[PDB]
Amino acid sequence: QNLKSTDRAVQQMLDKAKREGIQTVWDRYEAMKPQCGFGETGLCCRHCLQGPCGILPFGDEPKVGICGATAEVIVARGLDRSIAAGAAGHSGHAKHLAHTLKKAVQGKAASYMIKDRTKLHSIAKRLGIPTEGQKDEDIALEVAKAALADFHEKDTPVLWVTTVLPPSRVKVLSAHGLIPAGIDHEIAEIMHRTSMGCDADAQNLLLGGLRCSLADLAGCYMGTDLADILFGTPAPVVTESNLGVLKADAVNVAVHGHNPVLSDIIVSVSKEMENEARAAGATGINVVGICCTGNEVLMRHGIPACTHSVSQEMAMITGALDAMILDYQCIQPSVATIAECTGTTVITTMEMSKITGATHVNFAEEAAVENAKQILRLAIDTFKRRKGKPVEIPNIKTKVVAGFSTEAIINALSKLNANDPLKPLIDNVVNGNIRGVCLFAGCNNVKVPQDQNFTTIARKLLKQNVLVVATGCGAGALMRHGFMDPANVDELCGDGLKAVLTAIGEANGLGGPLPPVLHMGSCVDNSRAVALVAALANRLGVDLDRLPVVASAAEAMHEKAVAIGTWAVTIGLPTHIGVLPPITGSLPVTQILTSSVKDITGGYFIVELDPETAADKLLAAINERRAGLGLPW
Amino acid sequence: QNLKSTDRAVQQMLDKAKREGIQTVWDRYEAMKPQCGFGETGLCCRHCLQGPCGILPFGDEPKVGICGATAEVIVARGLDRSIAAGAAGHSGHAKHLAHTLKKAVQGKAASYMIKDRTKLHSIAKRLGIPTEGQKDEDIALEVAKAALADFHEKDTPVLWVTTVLPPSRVKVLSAHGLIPAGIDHEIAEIMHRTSMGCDADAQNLLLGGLRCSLADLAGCYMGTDLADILFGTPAPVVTESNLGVLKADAVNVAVHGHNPVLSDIIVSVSKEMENEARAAGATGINVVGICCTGNEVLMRHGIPACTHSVSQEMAMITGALDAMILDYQCIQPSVATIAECTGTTVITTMEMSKITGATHVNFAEEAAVENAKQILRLAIDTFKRRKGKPVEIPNIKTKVVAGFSTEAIINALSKLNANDPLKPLIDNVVNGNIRGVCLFAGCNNVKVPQDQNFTTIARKLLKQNVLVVATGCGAGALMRHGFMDPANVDELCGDGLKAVLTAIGEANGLGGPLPPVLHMGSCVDNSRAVALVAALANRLGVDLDRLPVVASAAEAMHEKAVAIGTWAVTIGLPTHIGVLPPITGSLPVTQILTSSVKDITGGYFIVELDPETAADKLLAAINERRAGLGLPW
Ligand code: SF4
Ligand code: SF4
Ligand code: FES
Ligand code: FES
Ligand SMILES: [Fe+3]
Ligand SMILES: [Fe+3]
């Protein structure tokens, strides 16, 4: 079981699933093997009905696609489409929040409101929206309008790109034609240019892809901005993670997917429904999180993280999960089948996201609270059906300190320097106490023993005094192995990093250090890491490609993670990916993405499947940036 | 050679290519075989880095994707993405024309103008744009603005859907949530919903796909509307088709791709450059068309069609093609390699469409004429380099009558009935002289002997008195085999259809019938067929799904043709496809697309690879509609 997941609760549930004859993601992976080498390497094209066209990586024919598409054209086109798909996911999330804010301030969705006035004003100033003497509702209406305008061509480029990066970075990108014109515009242009008989130049295609990845970044930053306005900017919180946060005595309700728009209401309403839960014979309603929707409610409300990503089915194998409430993205459709065995009620709530066999509740913001009550009532009924059933919740959980928004990180730092909060951090970068910054992002992947890359790399970097921050299922991997518990600072952190975490925490009235890893939120909250890095760049007077900052999508799966890794490269970061992306079938494309893009954006991909080697390579990237600033290392 | 293409000029050039060691599309197809059965059937998914996931059509494992995606989810998601890609091609074409018109009437692109005042006013009235007392330039500015607005969400749905179909059809579509909200919005939503862990219900996915196909229809209709405003509505023209329209003594210049924005200027400017061509020792400049850009200039100016689609390389094998001038879509990138052997200068002109090894001229409307001159000068230089070279142009061409816009068809009919032009057509439908209407659309496909399906089906339908109209490479196939020469009416048409073609032509001062097939233009001009069918529906008082009208993508290749076939189904037509689309790996998806969609939109796919059988099935669909109207058959 240890080759499947390094998570001991996951291993326990894998034993139970095996016992009970429930097929898992790892079983389905095993039945897939051996997987197709054309597709693994990127050398397959299905973009027209003359295909499929495969190209042998090595050897004889086929060597070229039927229309004459070369290996590097086919590889570049497939990669571009995955970037567009990731952009469309982060785009749709952000767009739905933009409409939600619009409805709220126009009197049409009373369940929603401006919860963060300060964030709303900051964003409007960053956008050029006049706030002086304006009502909050009108400012927010203008912010929502600008959000929706960034999806199409207009007078200006995508403002959630050009106003969030430092002017020098915008200038580098703009000299290369990389600034997106509109988010959905770029997505559509990708799909056009990659379709048969269109763009057939690897460099041209990849440049289009860098621009589309910045449209993805715009969607991420928009989604973060709007969720913060709507639901509050995260501040440090204490909670728990892993399957042990389920309670046999409670109605256990998982919020799963990505968009917090429904699940924030779920969290607020379940408090009122606790009495009706008690009448059903439960102790109450226990909301737990899965994947990024769980990260959102953990970040803002301290909702305990139940599990993530590849292991999501295991939450249901316990037999104690009464409801799993879905919006969209990264939901294994297998859940709808597994429910018939485990008694879980699986509830879809989004029109564009249905799963055959799952109960659908047609959620609308205009009636959010009522939908919430309905959904929770289904959960309560499900609990009633397992009164007296045996469950098996692994008694395994970790302590998680989280809520490290960029505003929270700055506020924490400001207790060491009120007028210049970034300076203590920069000071300790310069004197070597902090060697660099590494952002862990992205998913788990069934091909990698769950969490093994995240924790192996994290461990080596923390011993080398790297400040580690994390999002998404990277943050989930680290939280489930204790990397967010301050009690583990002694064991995990080098002396200089330990000193800095301890100074900041003890100056923030925690009596102890910050946790070993800083949890910066959901996958769209990778934008927060951008906000931090851009701030450091502005404070130092240098472009982002001169900072000792790296990223690692150590166990990447989703097309969103490919989009994210590509924009990390495009804004100038050495960007590791710990799973094989479909580019090895073309050496020229590989050379562009790992070497020559350095001369365009200053960032580059680091493809490395061995996590020890990957940690070495990330240390080398950090230290080369250090040397480029004339710092010791 | 006859198993490759039924075109005798193509066969001659295939002999020459074989002689000279130039690899062709058919050779590359042969080296691809045997092709992958997972991909052919649709049972492959690469939408995340846990894949590729294949599902065996029959037998043992793998039976399910790694995330639990079933065969019908995988099939529906792949089909939806191809519909979005086709939508993005027709979308990008239309968008570029919309910007071109905007620039023209704002004083920024003097090479462009309002060439069709009547079309501009008609379109504005159809859209609700006020024209009374407005300057033409301001009306056109409003029309361009509305065009660009249809790409994103706004107060209204996509007007190039809701104002071009009869109200009853809009009502049927709208009851099913099928009306697009914005063109690029729908494309992005497809890419979101089909990405990993999102929509996993075959019916939900396919409904999303029908809506996206209507976004494709909107792009098509927009592109037709705007090109007609900018360059003139086609009226009947006489010209020629096939390779024999090349002349050894001239500078031979192919316009190839889809968007007429550059190539219309090429046509106008080459007239002025004829003297400079003569000074180079040529007789002049001979512009010829390939694919849909060629269809555009054939439709408006009578430019001879040189070849189409699968056989495009053969135009260069002659050795007499001095320049091939590309915008985007359906260009085999092989041309850029083949040029090094044939001496042709291959010129790309679009930023999102480059081919390694091809000369790029950065075309801008603001300087169109100057770009045109530059491009033509390159052609002239190329001619100079083959002074005295032997060429081999097959002396094979057909006579083509074309230019049958819907306005032209109505004007022709109006000579039989001035006040009620649709009535003579309807009369002859009712008395059986016209059994029905069949639209031939779409590409050639290397898997089908070139043109064999188009001509076999056309022949059987014409003998049965079907009015046949055609677009795109379907029109190209029929024109190259004489189906657009009125001299062949006697041989090809049944007596009743012959009678109708003869009455209309003799009443239009042609001294003979209309040609056997009516050429309605490029692939976006499939919208013209919609305009005709909607008009017939409005004139009869019935929805489109009650009319004896069918469509045939007899040799479909491109994702655009899949989008087109899907919207033909969505607006209510029996819609044949003569190539295997990637849906056979899922029986439920096949059942939806060929049977149960009848109960939603009234149309349905007819999948049939045998063209004799397909003709029978199209006759049966037509006659079942006839019976449903209570007509004899
Ligand atoms: S676009 Fe080219 S490479 Fe792709 S499937 Fe079609 S013929 Fe093959
Ligand atoms: S989305 Fe599902 S079926 Fe597709 S590649 Fe990923 S795991 Fe396999
Ligand atoms: S040949 Fe296997 S991915 Fe296409
Ligand atoms: S397995 Fe061949 S198309 Fe993917
Ligand atoms: Fe996740
Ligand atoms: Fe074509």
Residue numbers in the entry:
A (entry chain A), B (entry chain A): 4 to 636
Reproduce passages from the article:
CODHs have high-resolution 3D structural information available and share highly conserved structures as simple homodimers.
The dissociation constant (Kd) values were 449 µM for WT and 144 µM for R57G/N59L, showing that WT has approximately four times lower affinity than R57G/N59L. Analysis of the catalytic properties of R57 and N59 variants revealed significantly different reaction kinetics for viologen reduction compared to WT. Specifically, these mutations seem to mitigate the repulsive effect between the positively charged electron mediator oxidized EV and Arg57, thereby facilitating easier access for viologen molecules.
